[PDB]
Design an enzyme around this catalytic site. Structure first.
Site, PDB file in Angstrom:
ATOM      1  CB  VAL A  26      -1.060   0.030   1.147  1.00  0.00           C
ATOM      2  CG1 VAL A  26      -2.122  -1.046   0.945  1.00  0.00           C
ATOM      3  CG2 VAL A  26      -0.409  -0.105   2.513  1.00  0.00           C
ATOM      4  N   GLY A  27       2.170   1.132  -0.075  1.00  0.00           N
ATOM      5  CA  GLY A  27       3.099   2.271  -0.056  1.00  0.00           C
ATOM      6  C   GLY A  27       4.409   1.993   0.674  1.00  0.00           C
ATOM      7  CB  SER A  28       7.756   2.623   0.156  1.00  0.00           C
ATOM      8  OG  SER A  28       7.681   1.329  -0.409  1.00  0.00           O
ATOM      9  N   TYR A  33      11.596   4.687   7.190  1.00  0.00           N
ATOM     10  CA  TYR A  33      10.767   4.141   8.259  1.00  0.00           C
ATOM     11  C   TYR A  33      10.358   2.679   7.986  1.00  0.00           C
ATOM     12  N   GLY A  34       9.778   2.423   6.811  1.00  0.00           N
ATOM     13  CA  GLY A  34       9.419   1.058   6.391  1.00  0.00           C
ATOM     14  C   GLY A  34       8.273   1.017   5.391  1.00  0.00           C
ATOM     15  CB  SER A  35       7.319  -0.997   2.643  1.00  0.00           C
ATOM     16  OG  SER A  35       7.686  -2.345   2.852  1.00  0.00           O
ATOM     17  CB  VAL A  36       2.295  -0.266   5.175  1.00  0.00           C
ATOM     18  CG1 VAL A  36       0.996  -0.851   5.723  1.00  0.00           C
ATOM     19  CG2 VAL A  36       2.994   0.582   6.241  1.00  0.00           C
ATOM     20  CE  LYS A  74       6.577   1.771   9.660  1.00  0.00           C
ATOM     21  NZ  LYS A  74       6.569   2.870  10.658  1.00  0.00           N
ATOM     22  CG  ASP A 113       2.920   7.879  11.508  1.00  0.00           C
ATOM     23  OD1 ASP A 113       3.180   8.349  10.374  1.00  0.00           O
ATOM     24  OD2 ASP A 113       2.662   6.673  11.685  1.00  0.00           O
TER      25      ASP A 113
HETATM   26  O1  0OM Z   1       0.068   2.571   6.533  1.00  0.00           O
HETATM   27  C1  0OM Z   1      -0.488   1.911   7.412  1.00  0.00           C
HETATM   28  O2  0OM Z   1       0.210   1.039   8.200  1.00  0.00           O
HETATM   29  C2  0OM Z   1       0.957   1.664   9.270  1.00  0.00           C
HETATM   30  C3  0OM Z   1       1.226   0.951  10.431  1.00  0.00           C
HETATM   31  C4  0OM Z   1       1.581   1.635  11.590  1.00  0.00           C
HETATM   32  C5  0OM Z   1       1.843   0.919  12.755  1.00  0.00           C
HETATM   33  C6  0OM Z   1       1.744  -0.471  12.761  1.00  0.00           C
HETATM   34  C7  0OM Z   1       1.387  -1.157  11.599  1.00  0.00           C
HETATM   35  C8  0OM Z   1       1.128  -0.442  10.431  1.00  0.00           C
HETATM   36  C9  0OM Z   1      -1.993   2.019   7.614  1.00  0.00           C
HETATM   37  C10 0OM Z   1      -2.496   2.590   8.782  1.00  0.00           C
HETATM   38  C11 0OM Z   1      -3.871   2.671   8.936  1.00  0.00           C
HETATM   39  C12 0OM Z   1      -4.670   2.174   7.911  1.00  0.00           C
HETATM   40  N1  0OM Z   1      -4.168   1.624   6.812  1.00  0.00           N
HETATM   41  C13 0OM Z   1      -2.858   1.533   6.632  1.00  0.00           C
END
Ligand code: 0OM
Ligand code: IRG
Length: 329
Positions: free
Chosen positions: A27-29, A30-33, A48, A158
């Site tokens: 879903v995108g790229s 701290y790290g990638s998710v 993540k 965050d």
């Molecule tokens: O980018 C996301 O993941 C971030 C994330 C943050 C902390 C722990 C696991 C994942 C995200 C957050 C909320 C809804 N969808 C994706």
């Protein structure tokens, strides 16, 4: 015993996750998710994978800091940890950290109706009351750090400078929790008008746009400023008068205007707090004193420590090991 893992390559990275998590999609790229299906709960989650979590002292401590913070957060308007895991079986193997949370919809980043603004700012303040009660400052509140689902439920996650309090721009090192209230004010203003309140092109422009709205500091604020050069800068500026917000936010709910006045005060000492704002008349239909909970004490004594990479790594490992999943309800 630990569950069964499986490898796959998603985009650039290898991903080794428990069989529990299925159908991973980036879903995108701290790290990638990745987006995933969680088979244990039947819910959609976000996984993540931190990048190079232990590549330096600062990375190591950041990794620990993020894991500590997420393990602490237990509130419906703040992001919480469903799971944390590593594919390693020993501290010695340990080199990858994955975090799991609820998949949330889009982020807050249009002109919204007044009732939508009410409910969203209410929820932000409710999460922030909680965060702040723990002696945590978010520092980076902005639309893209707010997740909102189709049901308009909001969770705090965050240019950053557009939402930054003026005392941070001016590099004051003893700023406190009300820097976040400033950001809430900028968010709320933007929701109500569909425009960035203070879209500075740099830090200097940023201050100029800010003071033009809120006025240049009076003698009373100027006397609390310890830095002679900071005092010189603002004292050397063109003395703008404080604008009438009821004129600047023409047509908005007068209570929204009044809350905005109380959030966007130059002097950090006289800015409304999260708990106070919750009791403001603008939130009359949502506020409930018995459902605005505070957090357990949070030990951040580790922030003042200077440790080796292997020591931060080992503290992080302990935290992965002691993790207790939240109740399935
Ligand atoms: O980018 C996301 O993941 C971030 C994330 C943050 C902390 C722990 C696991 C994942 C995200 C957050 C909320 C809804 N969808 C994706
Ligand atoms: N009690 C306070 C209240 C507000 C303050 C503030 N606010 C900035 C005008 C927005 N700035 C500063 C400061 C001090 C040294 C260097 C840079 C900034 N201190 C403040 C102390």
């Amino acid at each position: 015993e630990r569950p069964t893992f499986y490898r796959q390559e998603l985009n650039k990275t290898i991903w080794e996750v428990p069989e529990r998590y299925q159908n991973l999609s980036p879903v995108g790229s701290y790290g990638s998710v990745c987006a995933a299906f969680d088979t244990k709960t039947g819910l959609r989650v976000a996984v993540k994978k931190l990048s190079r979590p232990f590549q330096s002292i600062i990375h190591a401590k950041r990794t620990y800091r993020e894991l500590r913070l997420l393990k602490h957060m237990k509130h419906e308007n703040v992001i919480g940890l469903l799971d944390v895991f590593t594919p390693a079986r020993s501290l010695e193997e340990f080199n990858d950290v994955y975090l799991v949370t609820h998949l949330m919809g889009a982020d807050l980043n249009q002109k919204l109706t007044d009732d939508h603004v009410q409910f969203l700012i209410y929820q932000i303040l409710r999460g922030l009351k909680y965060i702040h009660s723990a002696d945590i400052i978010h520092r980076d509140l902005k639309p893209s750090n707010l997740a909102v689902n189709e049901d308009c439920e909001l969770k705090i996650l965050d240019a950053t400078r557009w939402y930054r309090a003026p005392e941070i721009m001016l590099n004051w090192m003893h700023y406190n929790q009300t820097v976040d209230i400033w950001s809430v004010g900028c968010i709320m203003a933007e929701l109500l008008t569909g425009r960035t309140l203070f879209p500075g092109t740099d830090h200097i422009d940023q201050l100029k746009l800010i003071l033009r709205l809120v006025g240049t500091p009076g003698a009373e604020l100027l006397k609390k400023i310890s830095s002679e050069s900071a005092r010189n800068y603002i004292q050397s500026l063109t003395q703008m008068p404080k604008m009438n917000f009821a004129n600047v936010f023409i047509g908005a709910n007068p209570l929204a205007v009044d809350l905005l006045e109380k959030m966007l005060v130059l002097d950090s000492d006289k800015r409304i707090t999260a708990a106070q704002a919750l009791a403001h008349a603008y939130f009359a239909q949502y506020h409930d004193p018995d459902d605005e909970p505070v957090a357990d004490p949070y030990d951040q004594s580790f922030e003042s420590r200077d440790l080796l990479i292997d020591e931060w790594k080992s503290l992080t490992y302990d935290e992965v090991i002691s993790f207790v999943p939240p109740p399935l309800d």
